[PDB]
Paper text:
We investigated the roles of three conserved prolines at positions 107, 226, and 258 in the β‐lactamase [name] from [name] and found that mutations can lead to dimerization of the enzyme and an overall less stable protein that is prone to aggregate over time. [name] has 15 proline residues but only these three are 97%–99% conserved among class A β‐lactamases (Armon et al., 2001; Ashkenazy et al., 2010; Berezin et al., 2004). In this study, we investigated the effects of substitutions on the structure, activity, and stability of [name]. It was found that substitutions in all three prolines lead to an overall less stable enzyme, more prone to oligomerization and aggregation. We propose that one of the roles of conserved prolines in [name] is to prevent protein association and maintain the monomeric state.
Residue numbers in the entry:
A (entry chain A): 29 to 83, 86 to 101, 113 to 145, 145A, 145B, 145C, 145D, 146 to 238, ...
B (entry chain D): 29 to 83, 86 to 100, 112 to 145, 145A, 145B, 145C, 145D, 146 to 238, ...
Write the structure that this text describes.
């Protein structure tokens, strides 16, 4: 019935839609293709910043980054990179943050390890920007699931994965995100608070992961993922699909 | 007529609009506040990439970025930074390229010097990302003019500021830009080619610089710049102002 409404959205937007909202005390979980794999695209940048915060003292956020270009001091701090990675979905920033995690594969293994540390046994990051938005449909590389990513985001924002000060930094960056106004945010009434991280890619990929707070003060975690493989590489992402999906979710949580 | 239409746009969008289109064989120049200063915002990224290309052999584009704390190789080269800076308007990429061009603290001077070398005596870059989008209205720092930036872009894409292979790289990156669909592109009919670089910032700043080709093969250079200083730091940029301005321009060039 809710399932029937999501199926109608898929029909209307010629798309595959995935939704997960964890249960609360007064609401059942919402799950639609929740264990199907979808490309992360830029949604990984929210947990990425969490990983960097967790692995380092707060002072590290003041570290001005340096690099070498022989197959150099910059004016950029890790904190500035965290801000850019979330609020502007800056890919180069994410690549530098991944490298800051250390380990093999530019930090992709370390990031995947951080997710494992949060009990996410499903998600994987294999490549970095820009390739991670460009895997063909069906490729498991660089994917998560609505279910997986929702439970990660829940621990980060609502749980204890980060101490309070670090948690506040992540929450604020997500709260001031500039890219999500036409996705989950558009589907929830204005008196709900929404913090989010978007993701977009080829094959009509459009994602948004959010923590929303009802007027009554109840937090919910909403993960919506979509793609349009029927259109091939050039399929247009449909933000309005995510907004409409968010509206269905809101109607159930109201 | 045209000046009156731009004035009306300013009134309707509560904004300051600047326009410059160089003359061609069959068309008069278009100029509206063309010599007034506006913040570059990310528009500087196109000339930035030209500067790096000019000062280096094409082999430089293959140089890898290694993040250093004391070494973590990224999957990123100078070429990929060029692609990111222009197509995704990556600020972090721009900052790395500024460092590549002038060294630590020297990129902005090197960039300004490059513009001087192209005969642009007006523009200046003083800060890096993100500060360069944040100067108070009336600060001359980090500004160009529609007139200045149009003539720079003309030399880069249509002139011989760059040798053919380098020129082709810059043109292609601009051609595949993902961020400008609602600005100049939105004002020109679909059978016109549009390559562009956008810029957005605080105080309602929204810019776009483009080279457009008519179906008959005639190139025009279009620079549109806007801000909403009266609304203060948080004023919303209005993309539709740029699209409308572009539509007026297109109607005159058709």
């Amino acid at each position: 019935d809710l399932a029937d409404r999501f199926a109608e959205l898929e029909r209307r937007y010629d798309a595959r839609l995935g939704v997960y909202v964890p249960a609360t005390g007064t609401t059942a979980a919402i799950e639609y293709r929740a264990d199907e794999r979808f490309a992360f695209c830029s949604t990984f940048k929210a947990p990425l910043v969490a990983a960097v915060l967790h692995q380092n003292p707060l002072t590290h956020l003041d570290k001005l980054i340096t690099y070498t270009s022989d197959d150099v001091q910059t004016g950029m701090t890790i904190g500035q990179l965290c801000d850019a990675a979330i609020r502007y979905s800056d890919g180069t920033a994410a690549n530098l943050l991944l490298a800051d995690l250390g380990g093999p594969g530019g930090g992709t293994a370390a990031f995947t390890g951080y997710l494992r540390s949060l009990g996410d046994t499903v998600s994987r990051l294999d490549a970095e920007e820009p390739e991670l938005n460009r895997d063909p449909p069906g490729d498991e590389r660089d994917t998560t699931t609505p279910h997986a990513i929702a439970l990660v985001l829940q621990q980060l924002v609502l749980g204890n994965a980060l101490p309070p000060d670090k948690r506040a930094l992540l929450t604020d960056w997500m709260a001031r995100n500039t890219t999500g106004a036409k996705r989950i945010r558009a589907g929830f009434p204005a008196d709900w608070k929404v913090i989010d991280k978007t993701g977009t890619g080829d094959y009509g990929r459009a994602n948004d992961i959010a923590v929303v707070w009802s007027p009554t003060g109840v937090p919910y975690v909403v993960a919506v993922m979509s793609d349009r493989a029927g259109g091939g590489y050039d399929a247009e992402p449909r933000e309005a699909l995510l907004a409409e999906a968010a509206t269905c979710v809101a109607g159930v949580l109201a």
